[PDB]
Amino acid sequence: DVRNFKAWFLPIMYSIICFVGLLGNGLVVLTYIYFKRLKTMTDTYLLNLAVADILFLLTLPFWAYSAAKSWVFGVHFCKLIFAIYKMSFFSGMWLLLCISIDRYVAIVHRHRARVLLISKLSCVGIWILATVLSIPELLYSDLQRSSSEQAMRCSLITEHVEAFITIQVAQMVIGFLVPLLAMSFCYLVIISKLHALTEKTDIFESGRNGNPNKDGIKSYRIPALLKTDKGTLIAGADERRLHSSDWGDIGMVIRRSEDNGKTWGDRVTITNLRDNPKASDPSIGSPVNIDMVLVQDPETKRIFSIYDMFPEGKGIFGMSSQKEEAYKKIDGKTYQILYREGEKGAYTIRENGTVYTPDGKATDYRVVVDPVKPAYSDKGDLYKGDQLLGNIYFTTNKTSPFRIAKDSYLWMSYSDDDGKTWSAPQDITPMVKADWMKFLGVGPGTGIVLRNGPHKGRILIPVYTTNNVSHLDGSQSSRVIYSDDHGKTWHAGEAVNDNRQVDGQKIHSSTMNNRRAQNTESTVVQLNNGDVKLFMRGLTGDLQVATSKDGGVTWEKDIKRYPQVKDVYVQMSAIHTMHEGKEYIILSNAGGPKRENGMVHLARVEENGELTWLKHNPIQKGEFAYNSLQELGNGEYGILYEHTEKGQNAYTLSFRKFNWEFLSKSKGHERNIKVIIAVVVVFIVFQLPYNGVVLAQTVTCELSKQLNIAYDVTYSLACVRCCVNPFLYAFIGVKFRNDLFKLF
Ligand SMILES: Cc1ccc([C@H](NC2=NS(=O)(=O)N=C2Nc2ccc(C)c(C(=O)N(C)C)c2O)C(C)(C)C)o1
Ligand code: NA
C-alpha cells in the first residue's frame, strides 16, 4: 500500500507554509526595526525567535525540490539543514525561557542602561548555546542510495547507530528539558501571583441558608485588618454565633496570617463573655461585645483592640430608657456602680472586686475584676465569699442580687506578642464618656498613630455619641478618643458637631436634634502636612470629610462634601499612602445604589490638604458592606470586607490583595496579555511531537511505516508553527497589530 502523489503533495505544502511563515515572520522583523527605540526585553527576545523561525523556514525550498525530484545539494548541505533545525528548536526553547525569567522578576526595567546589557548578552549566549548543541547533528544525516529507483534522498541515518544515545539525549536535556523545566517553574509561580491579586480568600466563613457553619457559628460581621511591625496580618471580626444582629452571643476574635495573607491561622479569642443560662430569649440573653478597632503603637509594639460592651439585652436597644448612673467618684477614685434588686442606692465595686454598700461598708460580695478563664468568660462573675452566685452583666432571671447600669460601655484589650495572646479587658468608659452622653461606641476598622507634628505618637480611635435629647434620631456625632501615653490613659476629643452651623444656628453634640446633621462611624487619616482627616458615615448621599488642625482634639467648622464619592450610609475605611514620591488616600466603600458593588477610590492629597479624586474602581461585585484597608508594602494593599455569595449568611469576611496597577489603571488594562502563553504552548505542542518521534526512531517493515507517517505529520506541524507564530502576535497580541497597522 504505497503512492507517489505524496511526492508532489509536499512541494505545495512546504511552499505555502514557507510564504505565510516568511511573510508573517518578515512583518515581525520590519515592525521591530522602525520601533526599535521603544523595545522591551521581550521585544528583543521575540525578534531573535523570528530569526530562528526564518532560518528554519529558509530550508523548506530544498525539501520541495527533493520531493519533486531528488537531493542535488550534497552531503554538506544535507548535514547542515538538520543541524540548522536544531538551532531553531533549541534557541526557541531558550528564548522562550528568557521571556519567563523576564516576566518572573517583573511579577515577583527600572534602569534601561542594563536592561540592554543582560538582554542582548543572552541573545548572543543562546545562539552560541543553540549552535554548539546542534553541531552534533552533522554526523547523523547524509545522502542515501535507498534502493528506491534512481533517487538520491537526504535523511537521518537508520537504526544501526547506537553510540548516539550518549550524545543526543544530552542535546535534548540541555536544549529542551532545561528550558521546559525552568519555564515551568517561572510560569507556575507567575500564575500563583496573578491568582493572589485577583481572587478573594474567605477568612471568616459564615454558615449557609441560615444554618451554622463548621464551628457552630452562623454569622461574622465587622472586619478590622491590621499589619503589624513583624509583617503579620491580623484580621478581626465579630463572631456572631446565633444570628447576624447587633446583639446576642458575640465574641471578639482574630486570625493571624504570617505570609502576607496567603494562609491564616486558627481563631484567637480576645473576649467572649458567658451567656446567661437562665435567660428567656437566648437570642438576646448574653452580654454583648460588638465592633472593634485595631491599632498597633509603633514604639512599644503593643496592639490594641477597642470595642463596645453592653450588659445582657438587645445591645444598644437594651439601654435603660431613663439614664442610670454607671460610675461614681469617691475620694478621688472612680468605681463602677452596682444596683441591687429591690433597692435604689448605688453599690460600688472597689479594690479587688469588693462590693461596698451605698454608705461605704464592705460586703462579703466580690466581683471577678481580674478574670482568668479562657476568653475571660468569667469577667463580671459575682461571688459571696468563695461561692459563685451570678454575674454583674446579667439583667434577667438573675441568680445574684447585683447588676451594673444598663448603659453603653467601651472596653480595651492589648497584645504584646503579635496578637497570639490578649490581656483581660480594661474598662476605659469613665475616661471618655461624659455625663450627657447616652451612647458612645467605636467606628469599627483600624485607628492610627500620628506620624508627624507636635502630637506625633498620639493614638486616635474613631467613636461616635448620642445624647438624651434625640438619641439615634438626631444626635449621632463623630469624634475621636486619643491617648498620648501609649495606651495607658484615654481622652475624648471634641465632636465635629460641637459649635457647628447647620441652618444658620450653632449646634452641639450634647444637645442637638437634627437627622441630616448626624455623622456616625468614621475612619481617620493623618496627612503629611499634619492635619487629621475624618471620613464619616452620614446621610447626604456623598462623602463627608472633617478636618482637624490640632491632632484630633477639635475640628474645623466646615464639613467638606465630595459628590465624586457616594456614601450609601454604610461604614467605610481609609488609609494614607505614598507612591513614587506623591501622597495619596485610598478609600473603600459600597458604590451603590445599595450595599453592593465594593469600590476602591483613589485620591491625591493636594498642597492645601484637599483631595483630588483620580480613580474609582470596583473591587467586589454584589453584596458589599463594612471593610478595612491596610498597606502591605511594595506597592500592595489588602482589604478585609463583608460579602455574601450563594446563600451565605450575612456576612462572610473575605480578603483581597491588590496593587497600584489595579488601583490606578482603567478597568480594561488588567494583565492576565499573556500572548506569551499562546506562543509557548504551540512551540511545545508542535515541535515536541517531531523531536520525540525522531528520538523513538532510534531505540515487518510496514510497522516502521507507522513510525514514518509519525515522522511526516509531526514534521509538518513543526513547519506550520513558524507561520502560526506571527498570527499569534496580531490576534491575541496587543502591541503588534496596533504597531504594524500604524506604520503602513
Ligand atoms: C517594538 C515592537 C513593535 C512590535 C513588537 C512586537 N512585540 C510584541 N508584539 S505583541 O504580540 O503585541 N507583544 C509584544 N511584546 C511583548 C509581549 C509581552 C510582554 C509582557 C511585553 C513586555 O515585555 N512588556 C514590558 C510590556 C511585550 O513587550 C515584536 C517584538 C513581536 C515585533 O515590538
Ligand atoms: Na515568529
Residue numbers in the entry: 52 to 159, 165 to 251, 1001 to 1472, 255 to 259, 262 to 288, 297 to 341
According to the publication:
The CC chemokine receptor 7 (CCR7) balances immunity and tolerance by homeostatic trafficking of immune cells. Important homeostatic CC motif chemokine ligands are CCL19 and CCL21, which bind the CC chemokine receptor 7 (CCR7) to guide B cells, T cells, and antigen-presenting dendritic cells to lymph nodes throughout the body (Förster et al., 1999, Förster et al., 2008). The human CCR7 shares the seven transmembrane (TM1–TM7) helical fold of GPCRs where helices are connected by three intracellular (ICL) and three extracellular (ECL) loops. A short aliphatic helix (H8) anchors CCR7 in the cytoplasmic side of the membrane.
Here, we present the crystal structure of human CCR7 fused to the protein Sialidase NanA by using data up to 2.1 Å resolution. However, our structure showed Cmp2105 bound to a pocket at the intracellular part of CCR7 between the ends of TM1, TM2, TM3, and TM6 and the loop between TM7 and H8; this was similar to what was seen for CCR2-RA-[R] in CCR2 (Zheng et al., 2016), Vercirnon in CCR9 (Oswald et al., 2016), and Cmpd-15PA in the β2-adrenergic receptor (Liu et al., 2017). The two amino groups of Cmp2105 form hydrogen bonds with Asp942.40 indicating a central rolein positioning the central core motif. The sulfonyl group interacts with a conserved patch of residues at the turn between TM7 and H8 (Tyr3267.53, Gly3308.47, Val3318.48, Lys3328.49, and Phe3338.50). The substituents form interactions to several residues in TM2 (including hydrogen bonds to Thr912.37 and Thr932.39) and TM1 (mainly hydrophobic Val791.53, Thr821.56, and Phe861.60). They further bridge well-conserved residues including Arg1543.50 of the ERY motif in TM3 and Tyr3267.53 of the NPxxY motif in TM7, both part of the cytoplasmic cleft that opens upon GPCR activation (Scheerer et al., 2008). Cmp2105 stabilizes an inactive CCR7 conformation as evidenced by comparisons of our structure with the activated conformation of the CX3CL1-chemokine-bound viral US28 receptor (Burg et al., 2015) and the inactive conformation of the CCR2 receptor, with orthosteric and allosteric antagonists (Zheng et al., 2016). Our assignment to a deactivated CCR7 is further confirmed by a putative sodium ion in a conserved site between TM2, TM3, TM6, and TM7, which is known to negatively modulate activity in many GPCRs (Liu et al., 2012). Based on an overlay with the rhodopsin-Gi protein complex (Kang et al., 2018) and the rhodopsin-arrestin complex (Kang et al., 2015), the intracellular binding pocket spatially overlaps with the intracellular effector binding site of CCR7. The addition of this small molecule ligand results in a strong stabilizing effect of up to 20.1°C on CCR7 in thermofluor experiments.
